[PDB]
Amino acid sequence: PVEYGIFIQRGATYTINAAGEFEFSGRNEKWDQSLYLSEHFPALFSDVP
């Protein structure tokens, strides 16, 4: 819990900006299957250090 609030701080999800790196959303959302075939990724797999 001491550094989970540092992870979920930057964002639970993210999008990719046109030509460049990732863009983490400052929101804390729960994941759903409706988002899969549309936009975003589970940011717990976004592998930016």
């Binding site: 959302e29 729960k30 759903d32 409706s34 988002l35």
Partner: protein, 50 residues
Amino acid sequence: TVTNEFASRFRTIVATLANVVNERAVQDDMQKATRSCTKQWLRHLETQFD
């Protein structure tokens, strides 16, 4: 011969009214469930209209 502008006017309403629903940033997930399953009503109804 096969245009019917009255049916096409309604098609334009459905098109621009869809974006208002497909933009409303919601949270907590249950609206994300209904936010996707509303187009199966939003598009079905426009086909019934024609």
